[PDB]
Design a protein around this ligand. Structure first.
Ligand SMILES: *Cc1c(COP(=O)(O)O)cnc(C)c1O
Ligand SMILES: *Cc1c(COP(=O)(O)O)cnc(C)c1O
Ligand SMILES: *Cc1c(COP(=O)(O)O)cnc(C)c1O
Ligand SMILES: *Cc1c(COP(=O)(O)O)cnc(C)c1O
Ligand SMILES: *Cc1c(COP(=O)(O)O)cnc(C)c1O
Ligand SMILES: *Cc1c(COP(=O)(O)O)cnc(C)c1O
Ligand code: NA
Ligand code: NA
Ligand code: NA
Ligand code: NA
Ligand code: NA
Ligand code: NA
Lengths: 302, 302, 302, 302, 302, 302
């Protein structure tokens, strides 16, 4: 069942009006940048909570500025479009909102659509992925800034992901050109060793993850954990007590193993279970301390 | 004015029937590979000549195999689709045919369309581009095989191309991760110094260019020129007597200068003028020696 | 109008006595190291203030030790030579003092001259440079230690600087062999984002800048600013609220833009305006807190 | 005893008139490029033979073009200046001629001098050097094109040369950034293994040596030797039957050993002895086959 | 059943006399170099044929010279030791002979043993391996010369080999630090595409394989095949018509696939079947053209 | 005089029973990992103190897990084996204990021996080494994780060590692939500049040194010193006030110089003398603050 609506170039339109030609936009897709924004439905409150909407909208405006898309949309327009579309679609459950900006062909024009679709959350569930390091190297600033969340950056993140599946793993992790740990294919990665949390620093060649930012805040401020952002080596992650992938799509995804070295305290391990549960209570609006991360959209009870 | 038809998933359909949803295929575009195939119209013969159709169709099948698209189309189907579409569209002039293959979401499905549109040839004309080397590095086998003609590989080739335009040049050339000359943004590059032709070897990190292959054949076999495929240094190209970009879209594009070092014998220089003219007579079907490169489509005089 | 004097090999001599043969010292210039030392004239006090003379003289002795020039001069001799020459020249305005050490040809001999010339300060003025990243890579420890302030290190810093001018920019910034931000051509670079100050760490492959050291002190101790010395990525600097070049010659030079991405809070931006003004009051001897950085030379009012 | 004359900026002048200020030209020396040209005195013929004068003069014009020195001198002017100065100096023995071009400070001016001094030839003598590989890496196209014979490129070639002397060797050889054999500090290197001659290819990151060019011609055309220009590994050179350094200053310099691995057939080994003797007979004008490499300057018997 | 004898430090001794302490030689094993030499038993002739004994013995002396083991053994001693041991052991079938040299601890002493054990040949059999590229990078000249056949070089070649087995492949192939194809874990690799044979050049960072040398000779001289020794890219090998591993242990080992891309003409493919059969007839002494590669040891019929 | 006993595969046995065949274990030695554990004899207390036994035993279990040796031994077994062997050998002086684990050949078996031998301590003595940087590059995570204390990792650490000796130095220091300071050949390195202690961070590509860990603790907690773990450049170490190598074998080894640049405050310098003396009092059991690092083995007075 399609959403009722989507937003396209400054306006909400019924889903079925947004038809284009098969041959529109394949060249535009080379330039395209996107965000993935979560909405979490609190049936008790009859409110959707859109997680860090403004951070996502600012990350998009920056990705657009680095692609050098001419100015057409604002942060406030993308935030309001997302609010308006989640209300108008009238779906009272968890959603993914996806803004996607693209430049169409000298005088390129900037366009964008936003669509919101139902999403499955796994923050109640206890599951684990078996990860491998890819024989494929992560994109770097020299060739393809990981900082831009460009569709093209995912060509790199399907060399790794299809390798991982055909060799019997659930997920790929990347090494950077210099042999250091980069990120997952769609997400940042965390390692627990002791109860010290470890994650690659930004200049390891990764996206400016809002989830990574969120986890680091929650780990330091709720749990009092030490969190190291640093150059991380492959072999030390094999020795991790726990590991997880985090991102908007990934929420908190435990890693059971890495190149078949098994995380000592399981998956989800204790620090992972804690961070997963705190995350969940934040995003569903049952933690008043983190309220400023949440954009409510009142829609009335399901 | 749109073409009458296009080919999509094993069938020709009127142009206007190929409508999809705005939100179809943005994830598929990450995987997408394409060819650009030239058709040259000989009004004297009333035939379109499709240049090296089978090489293009085989390059596409290989690009698809390296992306790991499941098998759905054959070389012979792509060659025949292109013949059939150029006839059915009933346009008696120069065309670009563009097959584009993409995988749609475990059990991914392989899809492809082909569309043929009128094209402007510049093989009569004498023009020249001012080129710069980009401060952006070419994609390599470690991160994004240049060998695959993937839409995503063009994200790299618009870092360079937009830099080139905003800094007052017509076109970008690339250096590889190791500092050696790679290719243009959409084309291979040739240098003339003496009347020795020079072009980067394939493992410099370039596409397996059919035009590059064609030029090397024509330079050796018609002109008796020495042609070096080797590691090429930046500074020596500044000292080139001539330079040109070559590809299907680019045909033979003379470079007047490179980072404002001007090619000594102009643009097009003498060896460039020769190769341009021989190319033109080959592709338009007025050189019986190269006939096996040509797929005629008889359509009757314009 | 030439200075009255200069210092050469342990002695002050009239300017016109320091004549050599056209063919002396071109081989010596390969080895040569130098400092640029500022003197700031306070007409109210009738004193020249020589900025961080001993740091400059120690940096020179170290540059000499790393070149492996045999010992001939001392730190104290270079400090006193600079004091004596600024007095003897009897010029009551802002000056640049330039010690230059060189080895002359087994048993190489160490020589040095120091000359002081009038200098224009721009610390009253509000101006801005448009910067590009160079397609040329910074020298590293593997080939040419950036730590040594050798004339030869400037061959690298005129690949970048002449590129920048011919492509319509005022100044070049460098990327290191690994693609990270290095420095300007003659100066260290600072970025303001938030009001967090950011500058590459030393092992990014930069000179041990006294101005950079000075700015970091002034930013932390006068302004209470956070200052990050770290690996800095190209794309984040495009997103900078402000940027500036700093060095002895450069003082504080605001950057309006970088590869045509414009710094959000202008040039000079607010944190830049503050640091410029504090710097100025320090170097001119109107800030008693920083007095230990200043070597007064009393000469009587202009 | 000084030469009678030198050439400076389009004119011959007595040696003693070419006096400048100690402080002229230290910044210009960063830009400076030079050639070293040999003159060989044949007392039997009363002629100096200037070796490959035009190649040297063209290499200089190219080095100048790559530095981007504005045009001021011609190839023919440098060739004639060198002829005229060797006649006017009236020294009837072996000489080194050294053109040195430099740009003086927006609107930079191009200047050049040429001076000719007596030189000791070692082509009668049988001597050998003990070489080490340097822990310092050769300059590459990314940072400092080895192709430009710039004074600054010798800062790199005194990291290696002073290391070599203090660790008990006569001479340094370089490895490139990728770990492959580059060149000596002032010369190209040849290895003999079998009686196959081996030397790094140009894009190993070396100067376009006229001596290297000369040796390769003489090895192929007089001796019928196989000569490989290719990527050369460190360890294989340890296993060389012979090795030598060649250049204008170096003529043919045998290497007895490399990191204390001794060349099997000694120094000079047999192929080295042959090439040394053929070189000598070429440069002294007693080999009519190579006459086109020689510019005679008749001056009458010593 | 143990061999009757082995050779150790210049003498043949019964197998059971060669007992040492558990704690002897673990430090020596860091330095150790070895060869693997094949003996092929021709029961018709009652002769063992030892394949390219002198090449193997010279490769060992070179490996020893590069490790800097003091001189103790000669090429002729290793050749004769191997002859004598294969006779004295009195085993009339295919054997592996393994010389292993090691330095024991200032004044290190050089030691060596040689032992010959029965070996299974697979040159009658038609079998195939499924290969992966390793996420582990091959050792290079910078860190560990692949040219030395050192036991330590196999630590690298069990990162790859254990990865390959746990991820469901039969064998690992390596990429070099620069992302190009290096070798297998114990063998060189060949690709057939067309009927052009392709194999990495030596400076791709590989061992000087005698089998690789043998195959290239046999391919050119018996089959008239084109054989390219060059930089080889990962993706092109996926497109290979055939592939094989070759070495002393490996003989000719067909590769059915590489990262699950299947070689078009199977395994063994036609050119592979030919080269396998020619190899077999060479090593068993039924090809008089290649007799100079064979060291017969007459022992009388089995 | 041999020890009375050693431990092998879960049991203590007389020294003379541990005899194997010359040809056992040369392939196993490729996989082998080891620790070096110090025992310090306090004749006053009649106790051996085994330094950080559990850290060493855990480092071994991790090295074994990363090699992928099947589980056979425990941490507690290695700790108890070492205690038991030092008692049973009945030697009342300083010892080195060396566990060495190895896998013997599909279904590899894990084996280990431990042997304890008398050791000379140099912690009373004042001596100094002259160090060079090696022209050989340190092993990295890409090829050979420095994190694993594998015998094979020492092949790299005898390229450097034999270079150092033949070029007149006492010891080699390494640069990493990126040109930064790695470690010594068998030890971590510390630099003193000011009285700030500096040592490369782990991801510089070094072993997880227990001695390095110990020194950093003692420097911070006893001396209140600042200790920087960071990327360290070659040239800054030349400017060090002091330097030392530290490890189990090396204890605290002062460096007098580095590529003949002499440490300003001598060797051992003051901070080095302090750390040496504190280390000594810790390991000999005369510092109750560090008692938890010590495993006593009471044996009665010598
Ligand atoms: C989006 C993304 C992430 C996670 O970022 P969030 O802002 O938390 O969604 C990680 N890696 C890649 C490659 C991404 O594109
Ligand atoms: C297609 C392409 C070329 C030229 O190849 P042709 O087969 O001659 O069209 C060159 N460079 C790039 C990046 C390409 O994609
Ligand atoms: C001198 C210099 C600087 C600035 O250092 P100061 O001590 O502040 O003058 C920056 N970059 C380079 C390349 C320099 O030579
Ligand atoms: C000049 C030079 C050579 C040799 O070139 P010739 O033209 O034969 O003198 C080799 N190496 C370097 C670095 C040089 O500058
Ligand atoms: C020995 C070896 C080979 C093959 O060499 P042969 O002389 O043919 O046995 C290939 N790779 C490695 C790593 C080797 O050690
Ligand atoms: C063991 C070792 C060290 C020092 O580690 P400790 O645990 O202090 O003995 C340093 N470098 C290397 C290469 C080592 O193997
Ligand atoms: Na609203
Ligand atoms: Na047809
Ligand atoms: Na004074
Ligand atoms: Na004349
Ligand atoms: Na015999
Ligand atoms: Na006990």
């Amino acid at each position: 069942e399609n959403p009722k609506y989507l937003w396209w170039n400054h306006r909400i339109i019924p889903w079925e009006e947004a038809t284009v030609h098969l041959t529109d936009y394949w060249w535009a897709s080379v330039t395209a940048v996107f965000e993935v924004i979560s909405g979490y439905w609190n049936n008790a409150e009859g409110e959707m909570y859109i997680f860090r909407l403004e951070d996502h909208a600012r990350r998009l405006e920056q990705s657009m500025q680095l692609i050098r898309m001419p100015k057409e949309f604002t942060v406030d327009e993308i935030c309001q479009a997302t609010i308006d579309l989640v209300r108008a679609n009238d779906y009272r459950g968890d959603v993914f909102i996806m803004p996607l900006a693209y430049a169409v062909g000298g005088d390129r024009t900037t366009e964008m659509f936003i669509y919101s679709r139902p999403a499955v959350s796994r923050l109640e569930e206890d599951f684990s992925l078996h990860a491998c390091y890819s024989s494929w190297t992560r994109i770097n600033e020299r060739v393809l800034p990981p900082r831009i969340k460009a569709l093209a950056n995912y060509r790199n993140s399907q060399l790794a992901s299809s390798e991982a599946a055909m060799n019997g793993y659930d997920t790929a992790l990347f090494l950077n050109p210099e042999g250091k740990v980069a990120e997952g294919t769609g997400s940042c990665v965390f390692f627990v060793r002791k109860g010290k949390l470890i994650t690659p620093d930004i200049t390891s060649g990764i996206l400016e993850s809002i989830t990574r930012d969120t986890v680091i805040h929650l780990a330091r401020e709720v749990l009092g954990l030490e969190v190291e952002e640093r150059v991380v080596d492959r072999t030390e992650t094999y020795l991790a007590d726990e590991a997880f992938l985090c991102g908007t799509h990934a929420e908190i995804t435990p890693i059971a193993s890495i190149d078949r070295h098994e995380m000592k305290h399981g998956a989800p391990g204790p620090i992972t279970r804690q961070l997963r549960d705190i995350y969940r209570e934040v995003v569903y609006g049952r933690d008043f301390r983190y309220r400023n991360w949440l954009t409510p959209v009142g829609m009335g009870v399901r």
